[PDB]
């Protein structure tokens, strides 16, 4: 693991905690390797828990979001010219492990081009589990540490699924204590409903569109909507205009 250690990133300021990154092969056959990044807590906070953080998409990188513009330790300067320290970084209190997943995302990769057209929850979960198990073998001092899993959005799927594997598995080196999900998928049907309601309640769609959304999408899945649902959806989208759907009252980027 000593080998995954980062001396210093270009443009990085001076800090008082270690960081590590590298790969871990989760399917020797297919040649699937997932990239990780771990930012620890300063020594005097040690031994702290371990937290695996996951972004969603599906298809989005945990390094790019989680670690680079959310709770990670640094923030990227403009024009990607350096870093700046995030005062609110979660690694002020925990050892945070960022995972690019699945394979094909971020820096994670596959030797079997097909993989990228064939992703799914299941495989994603089994790969993450594998990754862990090995990961602990590479970082044996983490064995038995309190451990938690967390992420956003599509990770609403990831977290619980993976949490379930870990749990069923019964590996003892892994002390899973719980998890946490933010703004995440949970139940297609309810989420569809709450989704439209909130939209209408935030002045974003006409009364008709709203009604249409309820009619088009209710039997669909969030991730594989019907054509009807999509149509309803194209309209709403037009009614919303140019705002940032992820943060209603903040500005769009130029």
């Amino acid at each position: 693991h000593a080998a995954d250690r980062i001396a210093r990133l270009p443009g990085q300021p001076a800090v008082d905690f270690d960081m590590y990154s590298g790969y871990i092969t989760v399917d020797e056959g297919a040649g699937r390797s997932l990239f990780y990044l771990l930012q620890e807590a300063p020594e005097d906070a040690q031994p702290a828990p371990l937290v695996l953080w996951l972004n969603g998409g599906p298809g989005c990188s945990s390094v790019a979001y989680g670690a680079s513009e959310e709770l990670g330790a640094f923030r990227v300067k403009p024009r990607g010219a350096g870093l700046v320290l995030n005062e609110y970084r979660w690694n002020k209190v925990a050892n945070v492990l960022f995972l690019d997943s699945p394979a094909g995302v971020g820096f994670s990769y596959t030797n079997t081009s097909s993989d990228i057209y064939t992703s799914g929850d299941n495989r994603t979960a089994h790969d993450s589990y594998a990754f862990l198990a090995k990961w602990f073998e590479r970082f044996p001092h983490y064995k038995y540490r309190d451990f938690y899993i967390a992420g956003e959005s599509y990770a609403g799927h990831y977290v619980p699924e993976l949490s379930q594997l870990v749990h069923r598995s019964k590996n003892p080196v892994i002390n899973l204590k719980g998890f946490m999900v933010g703004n995440g998928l949970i139940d297609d049907y309810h989420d569809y409903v709450g989704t439209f309601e909130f939209w209408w309640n935030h002045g974003i769609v006409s009364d008709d569109t709203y009604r249409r959304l309820k009619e088009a999408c209710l039997h669909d899945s969030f991730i594989h909507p019907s054509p009807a649902c999509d149509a309803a959806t194209d309209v709403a989208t037009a009614e919303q205009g140019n705002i940032d759907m992820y943060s209603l009252y903040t500005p769009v980027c130029n």
Binding site: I6, P49, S221, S247
Partner: protein, 152 residues
């Protein structure tokens, strides 16, 4: 301050040989593309995905695992109401009704503690809570880690 263009910097920064090198990434030069924040293809070629996660919730809850769900209340992508209804369907009992949680002088958001699961909203935060309400996000993190309900 807030800058809505951060994705753009990240993209620039992680595509430098400098950096990849310092990360031990793209070792060979064998990652035949540019580094992107999300994988398009993956995103458009997704396969299996259940419609509900509730059953799993039930199982883990039953396992004694600590479960916390949260929401940025100005997010329109996976809005607070979707979550309310979803958690609502588990049908858990309430231990501590919807109440405002504070950080400093301000209200950070709301929270409801059910038997087996804690729900928290973050006042004014967008989809990426730690981006929009960093300080609040951290409090949430510490509490969660402690297994203690948000403060009043």
């Amino acid at each position: 301050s807030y800058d809505p263009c951060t994705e753009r910097y990240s993209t620039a920064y992680y595509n430098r040989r400098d950096v990849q090198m310092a990360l031990h990434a793209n070792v060979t030069g064998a990652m035949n593309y540019t580094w992107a924040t999300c994988s398009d293809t993956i995103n458009t070629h997704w396969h299996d995905a259940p419609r509900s996660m509730l059953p799993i919730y039930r199982e883990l809850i039953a396992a004694g695992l600590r479960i916390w769900v949260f929401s940025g209340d100005t997010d329109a992508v996976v809005p607070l109401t979707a979550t309310r209804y979803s958690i609502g369907a588990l049908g858990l009992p309430t231990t501590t009704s919807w109440y405002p949680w504070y950080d400093d002088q301000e209200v950070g958001g709301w929270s409801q503690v059910y038997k087996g699961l804690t729900l928290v909203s973050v006042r004014g935060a967008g989809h990426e809570v730690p981006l929009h309400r960093p300080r609040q996000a951290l409090v949430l993190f510490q509490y969660f880690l402690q297994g203690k309900p948000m403060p009043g």
